[PDB]
């Protein structure tokens, strides 16, 4: 799911030692045309019993249940998409659905209501349907792999975040002050970047390796 391409993109940038330049010109690597359309704006880890609930930046919500199935609710508040473990996609609505999905739909409603009333929305000041294919958490970050190939990594301690988009060969970095910047990885290789971002990109490569090994 574009993971191999992303790995190669990261390897190239990391091997170029972006923070070891006579003059780092990170700003020259920005590319407004590569701004992502979708990213995870909120999430709730209730995997001890049900799964991982999350909200995308367009206000749609979704859940990757422990049984590896997914249920997505569009931002119109009624349209739904169910994805089986095998990837088989089915479409329905909150008002018209099979009884077999009643429980998962109720669970999604609970998740929606919660995230809607609580938590900050990541990338709120930025103007941009995939489902969550895979996710895992390390001791320092949560890794989210979307069906459109994007990989998002949220770092717990400093709240910085990376949204990797392999189709655009781009990466969006949200720093501690919530500054949202989108870069072309090829330009980061050419112009370099600060030590902090370089470190996050090295970590990202390792996280992509994990997604590939899973």
């Amino acid at each position: 799911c574009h993971l191999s391409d992303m790995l190669q993109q990261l390897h190239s940038v990391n091997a170029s030692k972006p923070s070891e330049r006579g003059l780092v010109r990170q700003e020259e690597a920005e590319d407004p045309a590569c701004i992502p359309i979708f990213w995870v704006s909120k999430w709730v880890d209730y995997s001890d019993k049900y799964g991982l609930g999350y909200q995308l930046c367009d206000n749609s919500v979704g859940v990757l249940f422990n049984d590896s199935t997914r249920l997505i609710l569009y931002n119109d508040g009624d349209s739904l998409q169910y994805i089986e473990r095998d990837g088989t996609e089915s479409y329905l609505t909150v008002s018209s659905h099979p009884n077999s999905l009643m429980k998962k739909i109720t669970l999604l409603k609970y998740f929606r209501n919660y995230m809607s009333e609580h938590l900050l929305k990541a990338g709120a000041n930025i103007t941009p349907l995939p489902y969550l294919r895979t996710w895992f958490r390390t001791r320092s970050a949560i890794i989210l792999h979307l069906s459109n190939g994007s990989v998002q990594i949220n770092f717990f301690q400093d709240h910085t975040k990376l949204i990797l988009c392999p189709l655009m060969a781009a990466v969006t970095y949200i720093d501690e002050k919530r500054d949202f910047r989108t870069y072309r990885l090829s330009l980061l290789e050419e112009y370099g970047c600060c030590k902090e971002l370089a470190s996050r990109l090295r970590y990202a490569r390792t996280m992509v390796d994990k997604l590939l090994s899973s």
Binding site: W43, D45, H118, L119, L120, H159
Partner: peptide, 6 residues
């Protein structure tokens, strides 16, 4: 954390 940032 068990949820994203508040």
């Amino acid at each position: 954390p068990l949820h994203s940032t508040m």
